[PDB]
């Protein structure tokens, strides 16, 4: 039933959360790293809005000309780090997945479902990504103040998009490792 | 009741398995096998385990036929029947109950609904000593009995297992054998094989054998 | 001496492993370079190093002195993280063989070298790619000139590329070996 | 001759494997050990390896006492002797020769210097052609024989192996035994371990058993 499939998914998230509490110290440093990598990543995507809202006469003409000039310089540069984000997500996901393979082996031995396999890790990836991304939208303003103290909050639409790649990561970057593990069988 | 149809075996990439495979099994039956260590009897089971496509010949997979099976249906059949291994397939870092319910966790029944049958099995294997334990607390033979119960779980239609007493010396070996005997006493269609018939000889049974990929190097010996 | 041959064969095996996963290693060295590109691209931005703000610009230098002074550390942490992840992943593979070696009785250096050389090299290669890729895009931007090509800084461009490799290897090795321990 | 003195080890679960145990090693001799049906004779063996710390007891391994575990001295002495798991650690992804050369890498001798002894072993077991994929698609006992040779490599000072031929067919088991017999024909202090002794009965050699943690259940049948 769809209701059980949710309970299946629900218990899947329950176990995923256990695993989150799992390695609570290891996962503590790990989520620290997850949010940290996100923050290192999100800062570039954030500086785009910084420039966008940033806007004598000797340099006034140059400022007028700079329109659309660096626009590509960030439009491309953001896409680049997205790849590295996917990379770290896959690396961590595979590292976790490789652990308890023998358990997974026996699980397969009894039987299984890709979802019975997938959800335990897919939910985990989505959660790690979402948490790191939220931490990004948070720390953005803190940096903004620590700087303008010498500052802007996340716009609502912007904060709304802040979760998508996090969701995208937990939907796909894991699905990347999914083949690398399943086709291994 | 359920038959086999002269299926030949070959992973010629490694080598050809066996000339042919045909045998008709009534329900609740018991069997055994032995022979030279060159027996891919292990492979024979893996084939019975449907670990690969038939690679030759035909088998009457009970109601179904093993070949041309939907890999989607593979889990469904994998649920249909249980088996064990000569290795201690028990999962450490879990309660004894946890390892037991692992199949139940797969099933998805209500947890209290699971616990009743869980205790039933514990008693069934005379394993009501402790539902939840670290594997290392238990005895080696106790450990094997644990996996025995693991298989016993789900009340599968039939059981396969493997060479039991992988280390059990004759007293324990015989004990485990009798355990399986009682398992069959609950009317059970299940058979295992080993490279030693001496104990198996002490038990009346069909005990068919084959040699070097012979379809049958031995007879029914009913 | 003999340890020289030890490291030599370790490098040989490491190179095999580099050719190892040659398509996977292709994306992997790509990842090494890409991580560096992000890391180097942030690492150097000292460019100048509305004219009414010309006088006020003097303190902008003091403001920027710490502007990315720590961003370098942050990227450094991220680099350590990726290095450890990759090392462990490779380290995770062949565990049974490692045991067997230990089963025969192993040498700590015997374990270490095949990995330490394995990682420091990847780091050095990414950092080298960084030095050229810097001006590669800089020139395309140009249309002070847009190309670094510094001398002592050019040298240090890959110095950390290997230092980080060695360090992250030490960390990952400690974790995995203590896990063996 | 070597010797050992009364020794016991609580498992961390307190599960003391042995109350005490002592034994004099007649240098260069051969002994076949089998004990209780489920005893941690396997644990007895791991202890023989001193894989764990010595816990309670005394033993003087020839010129070295097992006490004062110098972790540095481990490989310095982990190379002293060789072993063989009953579940033979077959190493894949290497050619049979390649897998057979694993000890060589540790040694660091010249590769041609190694190749001579390498062939010497293949002759010593007279082994060649186990199965289709060198290491992979071998013949089990021949793969087992290969593992035996792997042990035979390095001309170890003393040999050891637990439940060898654990999976073998009786004739194959006998063959393995004779292989060991030849191994002793090299004047080698080589031990043995077994779950049972039906064949070991034919082995007209000293045998010992321990009363399930006791120092001994039996004396040596000299």
Automatic annotation (TrEMBL), chains B, D:
GO terms for biological process: cell division. It comes from the Bacteria. Residues 2-222 form the ABC transporter domain. It is found in: Cell inner membrane; Cell membrane. The keyword Transmembrane helix does not apply. GO terms for molecular function: ATP binding; ATP hydrolysis activity; transmembrane transporter activity. It is a peripheral membrane protein. InterPro entries: AAA+_ATPase, ABC_transporter-like_ATP-bd, ABC_transpr_LolD-like, Cell_div_FtsE, P-loop_NTPase. Part of the ABC transporter FtsEX involved in cellular division. Important for assembly or stability of the septal ring. Belongs to the ABC transporter superfamily. Homodimer. Forms a membrane-associated complex with FtsX. This is Cell division ATP-binding protein FtsE. The gene is ftsE.
UniProtKB/TrEMBL annotation, chain C:
GO terms for cellular component: cell division site; plasma membrane. InterPro entries: ABC3_permease_C, FtsX, FtsX_ECD, FtsX_proteobact-type. One of its GO terms (biological process) is cell division. It comes from the Bacteria. It is found in: Cell inner membrane. Keywords: Cell cycle, Cell division, Cell inner membrane, Cell membrane, Membrane, Transmembrane, Transmembrane helix. It is a multi-pass membrane protein. The keyword Cell division applies. Residues 71-175 form the ABC3 transporter permease C-terminal domain. It holds the Pfam family FtsX_ECD. The chain crosses the membrane at residues 67-87, 115-138, 154-173. Forms a membrane-associated complex with FtsE. NCBIfam families: FtsX_Gneg. Part of the ABC transporter FtsEX involved in cellular division. Belongs to the ABC-4 integral membrane protein family. FtsX subfamily. This is Cell division protein FtsX. The gene is ftsX.
């Amino acid at each position: 039933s769809f209701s059980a499939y949710l309970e299946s998914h629900r218990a899947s998230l329950v176990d995923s959360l256990r695993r989150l509490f799992g390695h609570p110290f290891g996962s503590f440093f790990t989520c620290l790293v997850m949010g940290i990598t996100l923050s290192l990543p999100m800062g570039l995507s954030l500086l785009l809005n910084n420039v966008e809202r940033l806007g004598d006469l000797v340099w006034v003409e140059r400022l007028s000309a700079i329109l659309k000039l660096g626009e590509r310089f960030v439009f491309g540069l953001t896409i680049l780090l997205v790849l590295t984000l996917l990379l770290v997500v896959g690396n961590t996901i595979r590292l976790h997945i490789e652990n308890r393979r023998n358990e997974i082996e026996v699980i397969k031995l009894v039987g299984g479902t890709d979802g019975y396999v997938r959800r335990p890790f897919l939910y985990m990836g989505a959660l790690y990504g979402l948490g790191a991304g939220i931490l990004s939208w948070a720390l953005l303003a803190y940096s903004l103040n620590w700087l303008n103290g010498s500052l802007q909050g996340v716009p609502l639409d912007d904060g709304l998009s802040l979760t998508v790649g996090a969701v995208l990561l937990g939907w796909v970057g894991a699905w990347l490792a999914v083949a690398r593990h399943l086709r291994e069988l | 009741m359920i038959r086999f149809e002269q299926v030949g075996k070959r992973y010629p990439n490694g080598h050809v398995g066996l000339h042919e495979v045909s045998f008709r099994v009534h329900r609740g039956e018991i069997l055994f096998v032995t022979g030279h260590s060159g027996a891919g009897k292990s492979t024979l089971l893996r084939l019975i385990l449907a670990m690969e496509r038939p690679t030759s010949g035909k088998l009457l997979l009970g109601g179904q036929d093993l070949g041309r099976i939907t890999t989607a249906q593979i889990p469904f059949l994998r649920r249909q029947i249980g088996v064990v291994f000569q290795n201690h397939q028990l999962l450490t870092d879990r309660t004894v109950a946890d390892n037991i319910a692992l199949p139940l966790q797969i099933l998805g029944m209500p947890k209290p609904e699971i616990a009743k049958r869980v205790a039933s099995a514990l008693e069934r294997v005379n394993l009501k000593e402790k539902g939840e334990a670290l594997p290392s607390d238990l005895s080696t033979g106790q450990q094997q009995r644990v996996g025995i119960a693991r298989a016993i779980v789900h009340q599968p239609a039939l059981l396969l297992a493997d060479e039991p007493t992988g280390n059990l010396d004759p007293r324990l070996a015989s004990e485990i054998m009798g355990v399986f005997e009682d398992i069959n006493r609950l009317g059970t269609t299940v058979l295992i094989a080993s490279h030693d018939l001496a104990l198996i000889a002490r038990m009346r049974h069909r005990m068919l054998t084959l040699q070097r990929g012979r379809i049958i190097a031995d007879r029914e010996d009913e």
